[PDB]
Amino acid sequence: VEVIAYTCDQCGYEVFQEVNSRTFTPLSECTSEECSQNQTKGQLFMSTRASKFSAFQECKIQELSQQVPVGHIPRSLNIHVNGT
Amino acid sequence: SDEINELKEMVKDEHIYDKLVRSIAPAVFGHEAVKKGILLQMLGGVHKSTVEGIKLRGDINICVVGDPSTSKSQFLKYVVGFAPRSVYTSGKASSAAGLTAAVVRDEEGGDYTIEAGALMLADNGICCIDEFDKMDISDQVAIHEAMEQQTISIAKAGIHATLNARTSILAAANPVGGRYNRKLSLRGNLNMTAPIMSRFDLFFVILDDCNEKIDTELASHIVDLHMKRDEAIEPPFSAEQLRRYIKYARTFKP
Amino acid sequence: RFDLVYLVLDKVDEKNDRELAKHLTNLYLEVLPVEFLTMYISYAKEHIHPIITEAAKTELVRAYVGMRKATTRQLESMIRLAEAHAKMKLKNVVELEDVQEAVRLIRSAIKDYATQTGKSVIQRKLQEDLSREIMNVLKDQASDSMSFNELIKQINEHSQDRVESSDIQEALSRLQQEDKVIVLGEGVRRSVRL
Amino acid sequence: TGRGSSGVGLTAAVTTDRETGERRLEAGAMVLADRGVVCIDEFDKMTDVDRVAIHEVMEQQTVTIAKAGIHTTLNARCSVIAAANPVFGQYDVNRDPHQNIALPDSLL
Amino acid sequence: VRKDPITKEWTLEGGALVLADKGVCLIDEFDKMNDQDRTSIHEAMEQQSISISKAGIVTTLQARCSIIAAANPNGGRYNSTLPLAQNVSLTEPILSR
Amino acid sequence: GNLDVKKALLLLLVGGVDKRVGDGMKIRGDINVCLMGDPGVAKSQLLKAICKISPRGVYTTGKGSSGVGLTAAVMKDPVTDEMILEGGALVLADNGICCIDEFDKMDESDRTAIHEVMEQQTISISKAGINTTLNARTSILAAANPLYGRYNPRLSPLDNINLPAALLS
Amino acid sequence: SKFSFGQATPRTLLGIIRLSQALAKLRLADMVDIDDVEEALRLVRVSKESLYQ
């Protein structure tokens, strides 16, 4: 996820936010500009098609087993992908 | 009912000893000697005994030896559907469990649990088991303990156990060559050891002959059996009205 | 527990092995249905359950009384395939001539046994002479002592009709049961006394 | 000392969770043997399961393992020194000089 | 030594003898399993009060037990005029206790 | 030397469709050659060097993917989707080279494993998870090691290979 | 039971057809004939009796 779109089906103002780390939290429903500030607030929920989504894939590396010293075993490392 | 009255008429007969022995099973012909034995095994005797100590024998145990693929298999097929909750085993599985009572390994939080085996479930049951020659030597003292007194004991890798499984065995082993010697004794053709013979009663050995008359009548006796429908033989008793009859017979103490 | 066996045959068989080559000469270059016979049997197994009349039993006893010239294991199964062949070729009722092909297959079944387990020809002689070689030395020897070096050098060479060690070890286990002898290792023994 | 538990050339996937989220293939006995020498005793007084391990490390310089985790070819330059005893006392001269221990000839 | 559950320790669970202080066992002729356990009962009398240390603690319990037995000669009672070492399958030292 | 045996293999590195049978007569294809003998010329890198340049021909040995893990099975995985169908060699090296060594190793599972590929089309997982069966089209190149010392040629053969029924027929 | 194995199975007969078209595949000059299969039995005789030395 990189972008968000909550719809409340009253005002249709899709609240956007930046995507942080792998855990995040949705917000409330009385925060907008039209569907808020009255005795009736549209109850928010998500949307799929209005939310652009990226690619992601995880891999791990080791060592060549020829440049390792005489001692310890080699260890791993984490790598990510973005873009294409 | 009248069926409770039916016993009171049938108990007042005279030849019902011979009526019973003729009405055992249609799968055999002749040999009234073996037929008299299996009836007495089917009923129970007495078990109440002396005060403060030994419980004596509960019953009689009778085996039959003979050549295989003969009329020996028919009684075995007869009793297991006829007796109350009587079970059948071949006893070749002599090292894992079953005949030999053998504890299971730990599973789901408990080691040393009791096991099955078609021996300790012959409560009001006449268990049947064949082919004594082909097992090992270890069970041959194990069931030898299971014969004299009606309990067995085990203390294998866990606490001692005393389970009182009163039983009534019935066997059919094989001769040493398939054909029974005649001039000799059965001491050579028993193919067991000595003390389990004396621990037992007599076997009523089935003999055979290649006679030109007995074959044709046994042929005619067998062809009406596997008829789709020729039920012309009249046993004077049913399966169930014999079954309740011995259930009237058990409840005395002569 | 099985009814009838068969063995396949083999020889050099030059007229037939050449013919068997002609089969595999073919099937490489360039009604036998795949479902029609399958629905033909699966209908024909449970719908008509056929009968049995006296026309079979008269010939049936005529077979076995000459056959006696197993006992009844062969008799129970011999009608079942006789029934099923009547059930196959004529999907209505019993047949009286279906039994000549019954006796056709089982006569080929007993062709496999013309030539210990179900046989006693070696067992009418092996128990006899082994019951002789005990009574002689037990009338020579005041003791019951019989060591292992004597018995190899007594009974392996009196006659060459018995195998060396394949059946002499099992020869003594029945004498262990018949109140004669005892085992004390691969050496000294202990025999019967009066 | 040649006590032949499985661990003479392997790891047996001992990780101890390494503070909640780290799994480590802990070095049994080849990180010490590298460009050095070892010595083990009592070959015939062993089970089977060590003998399959000494097969691999002699035909090949490396072990590679994937027990509940990662395939990894770690290198090793080892040189064993052996010590065993004959079986039947002083029977070497009156019989064949070969088969005198009769451990598998995969190692001999 | 019955093994532990998950957060437990290798504890010590007795069998027959440590229960039976003044009782009864039986050894007649379990011929196959004779060499298995006879090396554990003839050191219950000789090394009286015996206990052991397999894979655990080295302790020693106390058991002043009594043994009776009902052995069975191979066949008849007079299988020989020859003596008792010819008759039974036991050897001397376990018999001599 | 040994130009005879280097010629016996190149014919099997091309294979080809045996016969387009059309009807339900799945004929045997892809014959398998086995070797035996104990040279000191390190017989392993003779055969396996061919395998590491031949197409799709996967290397194996005695340890690791034994005859139970020669096909595919279900195992443990990380915290993601467990109980996947992890394979051995024959579920991935279909229609290629199965270059085996160490034929006396893990034979309780291997002796089943060699018959089940010499038998046409029964590479399966007959477990308690599923009863699905996949294909079998791969050639076998075996090298059995002898008994102790040398194979005695004056003695009888099959003193060191333990499968009579897999060999002579 | 001295040296040799096999008792001339057709499973050996079908295999000698298999390797012939294999060697007819690699050396295809469209000449499936007596000389092509003469290359084939040339190999079965030298593979066999490798023990006779």
Swiss-Prot record, chain C:
Present with 8800 molecules/cell in log phase SD medium. Belongs to the MCM family. A motif (Arginine finger) lies at residues 1-3. This is DNA replication licensing factor MCM4. The gene is MCM4. Transmembrane segments: none annotated. Component of the MCM2-7 complex. The complex forms a toroidal hexameric ring with the proposed subunit order MCM2-MCM6-MCM4-MCM7-MCM3-MCM5; loaded onto DNA, forms a head-head double hexamer. Acts as a component of the MCM2-7 complex (MCM complex) which is the putative replicative helicase essential for 'once per cell cycle' DNA replication initiation and elongation in eukaryotic cells. The active ATPase sites in the MCM2-7 ring are formed through the interaction surfaces of two neighboring subunits such that a critical structure of a conserved arginine finger motif is provided in trans relative to the ATP-binding site of the Walker A box of the adjacent subunit. The six ATPase active sites, however, are likely to contribute differentially to the complex helicase activity. It is found in: Nucleus.
UniProtKB/Swiss-Prot annotation, chain D:
It is found in: Nucleus. Acts as a component of the MCM2-7 complex (MCM complex) which is the putative replicative helicase essential for 'once per cell cycle' DNA replication initiation and elongation in eukaryotic cells. The active ATPase sites in the MCM2-7 ring are formed through the interaction surfaces of two neighboring subunits such that a critical structure of a conserved arginine finger motif is provided in trans relative to the ATP-binding site of the Walker A box of the adjacent subunit. The six ATPase active sites, however, are likely to contribute differentially to the complex helicase activity. Present with 35100 molecules/cell in log phase SD medium. Component of the MCM2-7 complex. The complex forms a toroidal hexameric ring with the proposed subunit order MCM2-MCM6-MCM4-MCM7-MCM3-MCM5; loaded onto DNA, forms a head-head double hexamer. Interacts with CSM1. Belongs to the MCM family. This is DNA replication licensing factor MCM3. It comes from Saccharomyces cerevisiae (strain ATCC 204508 / S288c) (Baker's yeast). The gene is MCM3.
Curated annotation (Swiss-Prot), chain E:
Belongs to the MCM family. This is DNA replication licensing factor MCM2. Present with 1690 molecules/cell in log phase SD medium. Early fractionation of eukaryotic MCM proteins yielded a variety of dimeric, trimeric and tetrameric complexes with unclear biological significance. Specifically a MCM467 subcomplex is shown to have in vitro helicase activity which is inhibited by the MCM2 subunit. The MCM2-7 hexamer is the proposed physiological active complex. Acts as a component of the MCM2-7 complex (MCM complex) which is the putative replicative helicase essential for 'once per cell cycle' DNA replication initiation and elongation in eukaryotic cells. The active ATPase sites in the MCM2-7 ring are formed through the interaction surfaces of two neighboring subunits such that a critical structure of a conserved arginine finger motif is provided in trans relative to the ATP-binding site of the Walker A box of the adjacent subunit. It is found in: Nucleus. Component of the MCM2-7 complex. The complex forms a toroidal hexameric ring with the proposed subunit order MCM2-MCM6-MCM4-MCM7-MCM3-MCM5; loaded onto DNA, forms a head-head double hexamer. It comes from Saccharomyces cerevisiae (strain ATCC 204508 / S288c) (Baker's yeast).
Curated annotation (Swiss-Prot), chain F:
ATP 1 binds at residues 40, 42-44, 145. GO terms for molecular function: ATP binding; ATP hydrolysis activity; chromatin binding; DNA replication origin binding; MCM complex binding; single-stranded DNA helicase activity. Keywords: ATP-binding, Cell cycle, Cytoplasm, DNA replication, DNA-binding, Helicase, Hydrolase, Nucleotide-binding, Nucleus, Phosphoprotein. It comes from the Eukaryota. Residues 1-169 form the MCM domain. It is found in: Cytoplasm; Nucleus. The keyword Cytoplasm applies. Changing residue 43 to A: Loss of MCM2-7 complex helicase activity. GO terms for biological process: DNA replication; DNA replication initiation; DNA strand elongation involved in DNA replication; double-strand break repair via break-induced replication; nuclear DNA replication; pre-replicative complex assembly involved in nuclear cell cycle DNA replication; premeiotic DNA replication; silent mating-type cassette heterochromatin formation. The keyword Transcription regulation does not apply. GO terms for cellular component: chromosome, telomeric region; CMG complex; cytoplasm; DNA replication preinitiation complex; MCM complex; MCM core complex; nuclear pre-replicative complex; nuclear replication fork. Component of the MCM2-7 complex. The complex forms a toroidal hexameric ring with the proposed subunit order MCM2-MCM6-MCM4-MCM7-MCM3-MCM5; loaded onto DNA, forms a head-head double hexamer. Interacts with CSM1 and MCM10. Belongs to the MCM family. This is DNA replication licensing factor MCM7. It comes from Saccharomyces cerevisiae (strain ATCC 204508 / S288c) (Baker's yeast). The gene is MCM7.
